[PDB]
């Protein structure tokens, strides 16, 4: 069989990213603690221009919005977009979302191809898929495998995860590019690999379209991703403390820590309490409730029920805006 028609449909909508960045940190034998004390003067941190360079990006719409990974563009001073046809432009960064490793770009160009979107929820483990990006800077290349698994969360790459896992060969330089189904429709943004060698060993991960679209639409509208904030640190419940409360494995979440000055604080959430229901929804898994607070919009008064002094107490908080992560990519 052949997938050249899928390649023809989607490939023109996948672009190459070249990013440059000025940096104050060099090769690590030099410029360390030893430099300034290895019989040598302080002198000056010489800031080199390093090239994140190889990446990829998907042309989401004809108006010139590009999707990609945050870790490719974070910190860039310049982003060059190179189209399959050979056109080049410098892009501007509409906005980023480090917690899902996604970025939105804009270019001013017309006669721009756009990716047909598939439906992430409709993929099944076993479906053939194709990966399109710029491995090792060799040029746009297409690789082929199958959906290995779906909804991989708990990888620990980013704080909000719903990864597709693909067999197809994904290498450094594929980040940002398209994961596409046999028809040629976008089902993911290729993001991460698990390797022992720095190159593809057949364990690759893409962000599914459903999550990507939702992030991109919020960035275009508000320049940001809007997420609910409660301000609480929470840890799981075990049988061992299931008993101590006297009422056991109701899916409890333990309020280990409450952000000082937060909306949960401001609503009288207290350290050492126990959360039974968030917004009339039972709070069992820390992930579960953390994602439910993320989707709850800021400005929404919600009810929270907590087992505190051994008796249910009913509180109310006003969900706030979630603050950015700041330093890391």
């Amino acid at each position: 069989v052949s997938y050249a028609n899928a390649v023809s449909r989607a490939a023109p909508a996948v672009a190459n990213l070249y990013t440059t960045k000025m940096v104050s940190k060099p090769s690590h034998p030099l410029f360390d603690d030893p430099m300034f004390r290895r019989f040598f003067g302080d002198n000056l941190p010489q800031q080199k221009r390093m090239e994140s360079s190889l990446g990829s990006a998907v042309i989401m719409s004809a108006e010139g919005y590009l999707l990609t990974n945050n870790h490719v563009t974070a910190g860039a001073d310049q982003i060059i977009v190179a189209l399959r046809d050979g056109r080049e432009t410098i892009a501007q960064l509409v906005g980023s979302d480090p917690e899902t490793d996604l970025a939105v770009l804009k270019i001013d160009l017309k006669n721009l191809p756009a990716m047909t979107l598939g439906r992430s929820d409709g993929i099944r483990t076993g479906d053939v898929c194709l990966a399109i990006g710029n491995p090792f800077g060799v040029g746009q290349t297409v690789t082929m495998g199958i959906i290995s698994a779906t909804g991989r969360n708990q990888l620990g790459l980013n704080t909000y995860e719903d990864f597709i896992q693909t067999d197809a060969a994904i290498n450094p330089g594929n980040a940002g590019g398209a994961l596409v189904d046999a028809a040629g429709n976008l089902i993911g943004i290729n993001t991460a690999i698990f390797s022992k060698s720095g190159g593809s060993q057949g364990i690759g991960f893409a962000i599914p379209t459903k999550l990507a679209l939702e992030v991109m639409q919020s960035i275009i509208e508000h320049g940001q991703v809007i997420r609910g904030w409660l301000g609480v640190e929470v840890k799981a419940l075990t049988p061992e403390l299931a008993e101590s409360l006297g009422l056991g494995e109701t899916a409890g979440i333990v309020v280990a820590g409450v952000y000082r000055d937060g909306p949960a604080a401001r609503g009288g959430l207290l350290p050492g309490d126990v959360i039974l229901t968030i917004d009339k929804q039972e709070a069992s898994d820390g992930r579960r409730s953390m994602n439910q607070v993320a989707r709850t919009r800021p400005g929404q008064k919600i009810s929270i029920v907590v087992l505190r002094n051994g008796q249910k107490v009913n509180l109310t908080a006003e969900v706030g805006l979630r603050p950015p992560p700041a330093p890391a990519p």
Partner: peptide, 7 residues
Amino acid sequence: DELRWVF
């Protein structure tokens, strides 16, 4: 063990 979620 002890792992912490934050929202």
